[PDB]
């Protein structure tokens, strides 16, 4: 038996993402915490869903065609499909757990209707205010926002691999607020969706509905319609993956500080 092998020692231990809840759901004390459980040792450590969860999903040895491009990102669901309690990552609290946003002293919920798709953020991203985006707007100092459009509803704070399909430039309170469009790698049609122009072929009405909702959800809370760069048009996954890297880079610098 030839044993000639490239002694490529697998370093680190794989980690298992865990979440825990504390506080009373729908009240201001609710929090979803994240932890890593070493898969060899069993040791747990609290981690930050934002800084510590890989933006890029990778395994040790990639067996897919070197010619096939990569498109597997992690996605942190904040507002599950068919719900309206506005939850968010507490970028201010240690270990950035998920908390429900407070509008007054009262926990916030959308007045317009429900979030009809899983809504959240991509970890290890930062849309900086010191950067200027299309139409000359600056970032809103928050992780990049994502909308995963498959049939299955994620639990609050649930994380999973998605395939980026496109992006929408929404202006929010004077700043750039990209909404990345993506789909769970486990959804039945994930494979038939190659780029943003396929969303209407397989989920007719989905993109119009996403556009319309973000365009007007504030109006009924008193506000005004919202503005979009590119004409409320959805840019494709190439443009979207670029914005995400600019984003990952920006996150990298915030951490070097």
């Amino acid at each position: 038996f030839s044993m000639v092998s490239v002694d490529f020692a697998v370093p680190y231990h794989q980690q298992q993402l865990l979440t825990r809840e504390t506080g009373e759901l729908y009240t201001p004390s609710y929090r979803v915490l994240y932890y890593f459980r070493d898969m060899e040792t069993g040791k747990e450590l609290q981690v930050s869903p934002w800084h510590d969860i890989p933006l890029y999903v990778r395994d040790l040895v990639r067996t897919k065609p070197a010619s096939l491009p990569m498109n597997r990102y992690n996605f942190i669901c904040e507002i599950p499909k068919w719900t309206r309690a506005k939850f968010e990552i507490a970028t201010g609290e240690p270990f950035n757990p998920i908390k429900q946003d407070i509008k007054n002293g009262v926990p916030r919920f959308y007045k317009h209707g429900d979030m009809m798709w899983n809504y959240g953020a991509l970890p290890q991203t930062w849309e900086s205010t010191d950067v200027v985006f299309e139409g000359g707007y600056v970032g809103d100092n928050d992780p990049i926002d994502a909308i995963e459009i498959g049939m299955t509803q994620f639990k609050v704070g649930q994380v999973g691999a998605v395939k980026v399909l496109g992006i929408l430039g929404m202006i929010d309170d004077g700043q750039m607020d990209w909404k990345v469009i993506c789909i769970s790698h486990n959804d039945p049609i994930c494979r038939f969706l190659k780029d943003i122009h396929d969303v209407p072929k397989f989920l007719p009405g989905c993109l119009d509905a996403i556009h319309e909702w973000f365009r007007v959800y504030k109006i009924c809370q008193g506000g005004v319609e919202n503005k979009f760069v590119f004409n409320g048009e959805f840019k494709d996954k190439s443009f979207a993956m670029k914005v995400i890297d600019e984003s990952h880079y920006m996150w990298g610098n915030l951490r070097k500080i």
Copy 2:
């Protein structure tokens, strides 16, 4: 002055050591002649550096990424599978357990390349890496191992190229006796197949792919008769054991493979 920028950078600082490798395959020799070889290499995704590797010892048996985000309550079941004999074909290819870096080559009977006389292999047929069915171990019914990697039959609709590797979900196993030794046939399905997610365990195969398991039992039970030999014997009565049993057999196999290297 509505700007509250207080961003906590508290994080568990986990350095991601190693560089991700990209599997690559290259061919040499003339297909269907005895010089044909499929060789495997790794390409450091950082440095671009390539090294030749062994599909048998260097491709992980378990597919794993750096941070698992699936429920900790969901048991793991994603193994790597190396295709040797593509679906719908009959040239017997194999991992060269004796040559350096165990490339894939065509099985030679005398000096003539082998092909199945009975018909074509109707499913992708191959092996699971980092496995070893040791002759020094006695299995069910008192048969020893056959000294080769574990055998696997992936049952999805799509056909793999020769030497193609992919993630599969293990569903069950068949204990066939081949020349006095134990020869497990692990039943799996590509994690990319449209029905992979509805196939939970071996008893679901009949529900979604009726005929499939009978046709696997049958082909393996008689494929040697036409070439002159006898039918083949099976443990458990030609029954397919479920994924739990199958995973234990695969664990045993990976353990033995581990010892094999240490010697």
Copy 3:
């Protein structure tokens, strides 16, 4: 002389009477104004002749072809569904049970077209044709019917256009009380959805579309509060009954519809 041409023409001579009809829809009026109408017609697939029809009385409740080739042992479950309120929208459209040929029109509150204040309808919402929930019948918990076609909520990923008709598989039912009367909400899924085949009965919805049934119960239970009213009441405790129960309710409904016409 190897030609043996003896072709038996013995056959049961079943003449296929009627001509297949093609459903057609046409719109009139200005969308979102009270003049908007969606009208249905049939087009004889032979003669090309068109006739206006009623989406309510003329579209078959049961989808059936001339010779069923599915196992006689497999129970039938393919009903027609008329979409009134598309997935992700909020304009309340309805079948005009009072106008001739019952076209679809937008529901008018005073003289103003209606829209749901609470949010959008997140599933295609509509009715099953040839059904009638009679006021002269007392249902579970002693509530009478609401004098309209049965309500249906189709749960697939794809969104229907207003007034679009399609085959759906019935999976269960919810008994909501609406203004003292019984108001069934039949839960179904398009026969074209990728997971239609894995959804056997109402208890499978939670397994493949977790959240879905809770979100349906909730929206229907509170959608009226914001417009000033009260929460809504449910029979069976807001529980979703399975497809068998749901099919019996639909049969009863089709029977009553039959009487309705005879009068």
Copy 4:
């Protein structure tokens, strides 16, 4: 309540196809018989899988887009996927039941290997010898042959709706022997397969393997390779649906006689 409705009386009763077996499987007495069970009345009548089962699948009222073309044909499986006993419709026996073909006095089985796809015929079709096809070959006086390529294996004599995707002109003993390529309307990928050029995108190797098998299965039974019109090329579904109609027409005339 407006009751104005187009009184379009539904005539005939729907029929349920039934099959029964007689004789000993794999011996010469095995036969699969067909019957219709009226769905109202319960009355059963023996029918012929060939003359009595609609070539076109139709329901009373078509609710699909009038713009969407029709492509739902019935398919009678004779040789199930992964098997080798050559069964066939007995075009000579009354009510054309399925019987196993007899090569000598011995029931026939393929020597080459198994039929790897469900193999059968389309009902109400006839490939006449008095007609001349591409390359100038005449028909082989039999129903049109079909290969349904989905993942699920049909039982012997099982009938189901398929979507025609293409066709292959195989020459057999001097005559034209079309092999229609199709897929069960229930297979998971049926919807992604639009035409013959999609078969390689979703089932790579399937068309080459189908070509190769029909090209050589006779060689080992002593014979020679087989010839194909069009260069062993698979024509698309438009050409295939045309051949099927010529076929249905021809069947119609055989019956007027």
